[PDB]
Amino acid sequence: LGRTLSRWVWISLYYVAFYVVMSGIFALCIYVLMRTIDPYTPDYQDQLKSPGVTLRPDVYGEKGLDISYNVSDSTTWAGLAHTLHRFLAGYSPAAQEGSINCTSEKYFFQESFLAPNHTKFSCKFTADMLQNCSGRPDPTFGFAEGKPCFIIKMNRIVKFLPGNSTAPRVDCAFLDQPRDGPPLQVEYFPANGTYSLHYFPYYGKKAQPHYSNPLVAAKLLNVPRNRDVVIVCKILAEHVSFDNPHDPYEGKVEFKLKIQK
Amino acid sequence: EMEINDHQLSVAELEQKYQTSATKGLSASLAAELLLRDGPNALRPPRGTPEYVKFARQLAGGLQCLMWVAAAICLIAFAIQASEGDLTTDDNLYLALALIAVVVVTGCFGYYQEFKSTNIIASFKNLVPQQATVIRDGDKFQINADQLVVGDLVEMKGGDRVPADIRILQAQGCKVDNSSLTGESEPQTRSPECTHESPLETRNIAFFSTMCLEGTAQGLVVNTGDRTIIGRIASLASGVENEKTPIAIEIEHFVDIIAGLAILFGATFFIVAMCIGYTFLRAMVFFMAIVVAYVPEGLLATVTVCLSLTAKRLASKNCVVKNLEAVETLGSTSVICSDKTGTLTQNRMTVSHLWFDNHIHSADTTEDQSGQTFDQSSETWRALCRVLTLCNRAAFKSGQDAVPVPKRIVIGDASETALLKFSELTLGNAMGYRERFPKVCEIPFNSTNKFQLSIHTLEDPRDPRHVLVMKGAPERVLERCSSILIKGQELPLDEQWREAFQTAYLSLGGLGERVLGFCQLYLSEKDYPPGYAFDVEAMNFPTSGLCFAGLVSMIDPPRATVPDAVLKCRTAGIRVIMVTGDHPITAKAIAASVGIISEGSETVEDIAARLRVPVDQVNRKDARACVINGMQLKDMDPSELVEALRTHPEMVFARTSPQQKLVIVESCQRLGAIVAVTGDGVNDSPALKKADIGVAMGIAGSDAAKNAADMILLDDNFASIVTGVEQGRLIFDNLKKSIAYTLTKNIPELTPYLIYITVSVPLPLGCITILFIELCTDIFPSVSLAYEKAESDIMHLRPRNPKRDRLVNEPLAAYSYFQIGAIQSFAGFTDYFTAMAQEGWFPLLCVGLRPQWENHHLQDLQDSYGQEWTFGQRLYQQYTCYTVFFISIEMCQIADVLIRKTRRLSAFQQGFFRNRILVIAIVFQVCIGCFLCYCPGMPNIFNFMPIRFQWWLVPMPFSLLIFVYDEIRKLGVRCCPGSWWDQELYY
Ligand SMILES: CCCCCCCC/C=C\CCCCCCCC(=O)OC[C@H](COP(=O)(O)OCC[N+](C)(C)C)OC(=O)CCCCCCC/C=C/CCCCCCCC
Ligand SMILES: Cc1nc2c(OCc3ccccc3)cccn2c1CC#N
Ligand SMILES: *[C@@H]1O[C@H](CO)[C@@H](O)[C@H](O)[C@H]1NC(C)=O
Ligand SMILES: *[C@@H]1O[C@H](CO)[C@@H](O)[C@H](O)[C@H]1NC(C)=O
Ligand SMILES: *[C@@H]1O[C@H](CO)[C@@H](O)[C@H](O)[C@H]1NC(C)=O
Ligand SMILES: [Rb+]
Ligand SMILES: [Rb+]
Ligand SMILES: [Rb+]
């Protein structure tokens, strides 16, 4: 309404030219941007000096992981079991066909890319390796009993290496209650709680499109009924930190567990 | 009220009314009661200044209203979020705490500043109690002026301040200085008989504020305190309410721009937000976050410290401003209505002219003696100098050897004081000199003898005769001279010389000056031998056949620096009007002496007098000048005043009541002028208040005027007004440089949120960090632009046009927000993706990732290389997007502070290092910028992390595209000053 009808269009078009020019410059910058970076490795990975360990079944009440249920009442653990089942639906032999049977038992380093359309080789991790926590024989994963199976998993970081001495092994325990009760006791699968070192390192979602993190399964045999307990699973390994106070999931998982009867 | 009949009453009715005695006065008891009844004889000051309402008023204003609304909107949004369990609402809190904080802190500043102004002004006041000589129970004694009550018999002599409104009951040669009530420069006779019905123009009333120049009088207090004429004038000026200042009006108009844009950006992006599947609740919380982001948390700080720096400049030239806004007003001013007496003039009867040796000489009348003196070589001079130095009983108060001679207090009549200062300035040590010539006879000024005479013995012993010296009205002196000193001799006083005398006499009276003749006679030593017994009453010495010496003549003259100031103001396009209560002859004379009315410009009465035509037939357009007097100003319809005001551009209002000065100021404001008035007396206090800025004389000025005024000339130096103009045009031009520099960075703060809404990419920019930008890093850069010199010749420009010419307008807003802001945005996002990609998140993954990004329940999200990141880790990465968008912003602001240095000139033309303070500010900018990043622990204090030095470099191309794009802009501005390109890309 203000300026002239004949030039409203003229600098309307000027702004158009301004945005298209600038837009263009952005376009070219992001083209160069993507041409700069390696497709198989991260340039810097700065927040990943140590990996975070996640856990299944992940149920957060508030303030973090809070897993409560009542063994006599299928409906409080059915969905827990189900999130285990559909999590391991990609750890089945049928699904996990495109990977090799790792027996290296030490860091598996691939310098040359040998696999269809220039990918590289991943190890196997099939469900049955978690054994008593695989979904067979028990499809409740030890919940119905009162010794539930939690599936601990380490986050993947390209070319990261966790140690030489032994395999990186997980360790779950109470947050000490030493006078008023025994200490926690767990059976892990595969045994000793170890992710075999042939599962490291990761070479990237392009180098290994069909890759899968190693698991361990903690089966809690000790835990008392109708009492809140807090449980921590740390990863014991040299090249891993488990007490970064600004990230409570770096190397460790905590959760509150209550098993009611 | 009371006085309109008090002067008219008979003495019987007067002592009847007031229950008093015209000869003995009030009883001691009664007067004491009356004092209880009526309160002190003193003007009431403003009753309440609770120190806390000073502060509470500091917290209002266009920006501050905006900041307050924006704080509320912050908190209402915090409610709406917390109720539906949205985390990191703490950003809302910070924003409001900051906002409130900024306005409070500015507030304290603005309050303490005002404090520090009002004390310095108060440092100058004289707080010793004025006194009165009262007669009570027939006893004459001294009381404080404020213990006077209505009905007191008081007494006045030369030197006294009239202590109340007194009805004059008797007077011997009482002459009084009404320059403060009326504008009247000339002494005013007081006498007991009713001269008028209006007490303002009657002669039998002396006025509570004024000074008794000479003579003696006695009379009855007819009014006290605020019931005096002075108190009613200061009432009238209290009820005057002053308009909003120009700078405030400008700030409000651009707060209206910012409001408009924030409202509509909120609207359109809220509509948009619904059409992408957001809860009504959160499209409204975005609406809120957006209008808040258009509010610059820091601009109030930068504007006030800018203004405050100009207040420092003006203070250091003895110009003290009460509130910071006023610092600017003289820049935008386009009319100056000025007082004459004591404002333009000195209000100090000064010797101006002399007639001796058949010639009219002219003395230096300036107060610092920076003018050009007259010819002091001749014998005739030193004779005249002797008559005027010896025939005078005035005298300097003691302990004054250091205070300049025009500024010295003296005990003597008006004329005699003038002449004493004249002799002291010309001959030096007058009192000593005339002591060396023992006075042995004396006739004081006498209404039956009509002259003043005194006979003296001489200096060296070898000369034994006497010299009779005389001074009086010129015609009366001449009728007793038979002789005249000329050019080394003493000539018969023939008809040639009398015609010459009368032409010089009327020539000098025509300038409206007070001229007196001076004569002398050396008496014989035969007929008047050493020790001769001179008897006045039987006049046994001669008083005719005297030897005429010369004329000396006097006037109230302009202040030294005034005429150049008036001319500098006019060549800055400032119409300058004279509003004075004095009489029109004087009004015009001074108007010419100073430059109100130019050489060769004539009033319609001058055209008629030149062509010898009835004034009716003269073409009024042919008269540059006009002198309208105050009792035809009534008869003028407001449109007769607008016509007259814009037909003759050199206007002189004479004999104008305080109200009429308010009328003129108001009539000019209605025609859109920003008018300023300059003044001293109380008759200016109303006008001074109404004006867009009132400028009072520090020393000359009455208390009511100093109170009405926004600005005080502590040394009474009128030329500070022309520096006021200059500084005022500077900050204006410099404020829009600083404003613009702070507004642009607002768009590369809002857009990353806008995108983050619509595209749902992880948060590019957090609120903590845009607080650090706005309230910390970019502040010094923004106020440093206040140190920019002019680019054109500021002082030959016309006044800014308040309608078209504005602080920020559509060009500056558009260009700064949506072009340089855009470039800054693109620089931000470019650095965003770069940091992300380098740390692992590809741009296409970034589209719609926000839900998963912020999801505290995903502690294993996969990046483009399929790496699983905890929540904290993605969070640190987000802080890295903060720091990266922040340092992008900064670098483009290093481009922006330098580009805003100039609005038409090139930086290669004038400089990168011109402004040493701005270079300092940038060094400070990257210093704290680096401290925010690399200090140990910063991630967990504020959200900044040490960005890799790659990411510093990534924006610098966009910065320099800003430099070069704006340099070509302000290269075509000056290269091709045509139509198309300047309207659009000049601000
Ligand atoms: C009011 C006016 C508003 C105007 C806004 C206009 C902005 C539009 C500008 C640019 C959009 C992107 C242009 C894409 C085309 C260029 C080339 C390109 O395709 O590049 C490649 C990348 C992906 O490469 P790759 O993975 O296939 O390579 C393989 C990786 N290797 C090499 C390691 C194997 O393409 C991708 O990522 C595709 C995904 C790109 C991510 C979307 C960007 C969203 C950000 C928007 C903010 C824009 C700034 C707004 C500021 C306004 C200020 C007023
Ligand atoms: C411009 C902007 N606004 C926010 C924000 O809004 C908070 C808010 C909500 C309601 C009312 C007022 C404020 C939160 C986080 C970042 N913000 C950014 C920067 C981009 N990135
Ligand atoms: C395990 O390794 C053996 C080596 O003989 C191989 O035949 C087999 O295929 C591997 N496991 C599976 C399920 O393929
Ligand atoms: C696991 O299952 C086997 C039988 O398959 C059983 O012998 C063993 O004790 C089980 N371990 C635990 C801890 O229940
Ligand atoms: C557990 O569930 C059963 C069946 O619903 C109920 O009877 C029992 O009391 C529950 N125990 C507790 C501790 O809630
Ligand atoms: Rb802002
Ligand atoms: Rb002179
Ligand atoms: Rb005012």
Per-domain boundaries in chain A: 1-261
CB atoms closer than 10 angstroms to residue B64: 20
The experimental method is X-ray
Quick check: CB of A187 below 6 Å from ligand 4? yes
Residue type, B528: Y
Burial letters for A182-199: b for 16+ Cβ neighbours within 10 Å, e otherwise?
eebebbbbbeebbbbbbb
Quick one: tokens of A239? 């090249």
CB–CB contact A156 B838 (8 Å): no
Å from A17 to nearest chain B CA?
Answer: 11
Are residues B338 and B577 in contact, defined by beta-carbon separation less than 8 angstroms?
yes
Q: Roughly what angle, to the nearest 10 degrees, separates helices B747-758 and B871-900?
A: 140
Quick one: tokens of B253? 């108009």
Listed in sequence order, the residues at least 6 apart from B663 whose beta carbon sits closer than 8 Å to its beta carbon are B633, B641
DSSP secondary structure string, chain A? --S-HHHHHHHHHHHHHHHHHHHHHHHHHHHHHHHHS-SSS-S---S-SS-BEEEES--B-SSSBEEEEETT-GGGTHHHHHHHHHHHTTSSTTTT-SSB-----S-----S--STTT----B---GGGGGGGSSSS-TTTTTTTT--EEEEEEPP-BT----SSS--EEEEEES---SSS----EEEESGGGB--GGG--B--TTT-TT----EEEEEE-SPPBTS-EEEEEEEE-TT-----TT-TTBSEEEEEEEEE-
Q: Which of B820, B845, B860 is best to mutate for the A interface (most A CBs within 10 A)?
A: B860
Residues of chain B with CATH 3.40.1110.10: 347-557
B984 annotated binding-site participant = no
CB–CB contact A46 B839 (8 Å): yes
CATH 3.40.1110.10 fits B347-557, yes or no: yes
SS3 helix, strand, coil % of chain A, rounded to 5? Answer: 25, 20, 55
| E-state strands within B429-495 | 439-443, 451-457, 466-472, 481-486, 489-492
CB atoms closer than 10 angstroms to residue A4: 9
User: How far is CA A93 from its chain centroid?
Assistant: 20
Bridge partner list, B551: B355, B517
Q: Which atom of ligand 4 is nearest to the CA of A132?
A: 1
B339 is catalytic: yes
Are residues B412 and B395 in contact, defined by beta-carbon separation less than 8 angstroms?
yes
CB atoms closer than 10 angstroms to residue B11: 14
Residues of chain B with CATH 1.20.1110.10: 57-110+240-333+719-987
Residue type, B651: M
CB atoms closer than 10 angstroms to residue B827: 30
Q: Which atom of ligand 3 is nearest to the CA of A93?
A: 13
Positive or negative: CA dihedral B473, B474, B480, B481: positive
CA dist., res. B283 & res. B355, Å (int)? 90
CA distances from B93 to B76, B283, B301, B854, B875 (A): 10, 19, 20, 20, 20
3-state DSSP call for residue B223?
A: strand
The residue with tokens 């001796």 is B356
Are residues B184 and B583 in contact, defined by beta-carbon separation less than 8 angstroms?
yes
- Radius of gyration over every alpha carbon of chain A, rounded to an integer in angstroms: 25
CA dist., res. B452 & res. B516, Å (int)? 11
Ligand 1 atom 34 nearest Cα: A39
Report A:206-245 residues touching B (Cβ under 8 A).
206, 211, 213, 244
Bridge partner list, B575: B335
Ligand 2 pocket list (CB less than 6 A): B 73-74, 77, 91-92, 95, 285, 288-289, 292-293, 749-750, 752-753, 756, 763-767, 770
The residue with tokens 């300058």 is B576
Q: Which chain B residue has the Cα nearest residue A64? A: B857
CA dist., res. B689 & res. B695, Å (int)? 10
CA dist., res. B394 & res. A251, Å (int)? 103
Residue A127, φ and ψ in degrees, nearest 5: -50, -45
Peptide bond between residue A190 and the one before it cis (omega within 30 degrees of 0): yes
Are residues B217 and B190 in contact, defined by beta-carbon separation less than 8 angstroms?
yes
B334-346+558-718, CATH topology level:
Rossmann fold (3.40.50)
Quick one: tokens of B53? 């309402």
Burial class from Cβ neighbours inside 10 Å (0-12, 13-18, 19+) for residue B144 reads middle
3-state secondary structure B382-412: HHHHHHHHHCCCCEECCCCCCCCHHHCCEEC
Q: Roughly what angle, to the nearest 10 degrees, separates helices A5-36 and B821-839?
A: 20
Burial class from Cβ neighbours inside 10 Å (0-12, 13-18, 19+) for residue A52 reads buried
Residue type, B87: L
Listed in sequence order, the residues at least 6 apart from B588 whose beta carbon sits closer than 8 Å to its beta carbon are B597, B603, B625, B627, B652, B654
- Radius of gyration over every alpha carbon of chain B, rounded to an integer in angstroms: 38
Are residues B469 and B453 in contact, defined by beta-carbon separation less than 8 angstroms?
yes
Residue A232, φ and ψ in degrees, nearest 5: -115, 135
Size (chain A), residues? 261
CA distances from B644 to B639, B677, B691, B775, B912 (A): 8, 20, 20, 52, 51
Q: Which chain A residue has the Cα nearest residue B833? A: A30
CB–CB contact A42 B867 (8 Å): yes
Are residues B388 and B396 in contact, defined by beta-carbon separation less than 8 angstroms?
no
Q: Is A8 on the interface with B (CB under 8 A)?
A: no
Angle in degrees, CA B764, B820, A14, rounded to 5: 115
Å from A230 to nearest chain B CA?
Answer: 18
Ligand 3 atom 1 nearest Cα: A101
Ligand 4 centroid, distance to A102 Cα (angstroms) = 25
Burial letters for B294-303: b for 16+ Cβ neighbours within 10 Å, e otherwise?
bbbbbbbbbb
CA dist., res. B572 & res. B584, Å (int)? 27
Size (chain B), residues? 987
Cβ contacts of A65 on chain B, cutoff 8 Å: none
Burial class from Cβ neighbours inside 10 Å (0-12, 13-18, 19+) for residue B691 reads buried
Helix (H) or strand (E) holding A231: strand A229-236
First vs last C-alpha separation in chain B: 58
CB atoms closer than 10 angstroms to residue B118: 13
Q: Is A73 on the interface with B (CB under 8 A)?
A: no
Residue B499, φ and ψ in degrees, nearest 5: -60, -40
Q: Which of A150, A155, A152, A149 is nearest to A250 (CA)?
A: A155
CA dist., res. B661 & res. B655, Å (int)? 10
Q: Is B873 on the interface with A (CB under 8 A)?
A: yes
Quick check: CB of A222 below 6 Å from ligand 4? no
Listed in sequence order, the residues at least 6 apart from B825 whose beta carbon sits closer than 8 Å to its beta carbon are B747, B748, B751, B752
Burial class from Cβ neighbours inside 10 Å (0-12, 13-18, 19+) for residue A209 reads middle
Question: What is the phi-psi region of residue B428: left when phi exceeds 0, alpha when psi lies from -120 to 50, beta otherwise?
Answer: left
Quick one: tokens of B119? 């004390």
Ligand 2 centroid, distance to B933 Cα (angstroms) = 22
Quick one: tokens of A161? 């290496």
Residue type, B962: I
3-state DSSP call for residue B864?
A: coil
B341 annotated binding-site participant = yes
Q: Which chain A residue has the Cα nearest residue B872? A: A247
Report A:46-65 residues touching B (Cβ under 8 A).
46-48, 51-52, 54, 58, 60
Ligand 8 centroid, distance to B434 Cα (angstroms) = 50
Strands B546-555 and A66-70 turn out to be unpaired
Ligand 2 atom 16 nearest Cα: B766
The architecture of the domain spanning B57-110+240-333+719-987 is Up-down Bundle (1.20)
The residue with tokens 């038992």 is A105
Q: Mark out the alpha helices in B240-279 (DSSP H runs).
A: 246-274
Classify domain B1-40+120-239 by CATH number: 2.70.150.10
Count helices and strands in chain A by DSSP H and E runs: 2, 8
Q: Which of B108, B570, B115 is nearest to B338 (CA)?
A: B570
Q: Which of A211, A26, A242 is nearest to A119 (CA)?
A: A211
Residues of chain B with CATH 3.40.50.1000: 334-346+558-718
Quick check: CB of A101 below 6 Å from ligand 3? yes
Are residues B337 and B661 in contact, defined by beta-carbon separation less than 8 angstroms?
yes
Angle in degrees, CA B752, B756, B761, rounded to 5: 115
Angle in degrees, CA B799, B804, B807, rounded to 5: 80
Q: Which of B390, B242, B398, B46 is nearest to B710 (CA)?
A: B242
Out of B339, B556, B733, B778, the active site residue is: B339
Angle in degrees, CA A210, A216, A220, rounded to 5: 150
Strands B546-555 and B514-523 turn out to be antiparallel
Ligand 7 centroid, distance to B373 Cα (angstroms) = 4
Q: Which of B706, B679, B711 is nearest to B693 (CA)?
A: B711
Strands B335-338 and B675-679 turn out to be parallel
Q: Which of A161, A156, A171, A144 is nearest to A242 (CA)?
A: A171
Q: Which of B679, B728, B727 is nearest to B707 (CA)?
A: B679
B684 annotated binding-site participant = yes
DSSP secondary structure string, B668-716? HHHTT--EEEEE-SGGGHHHHHHSSEEEEETTT--HHHHHH-SEEETT-
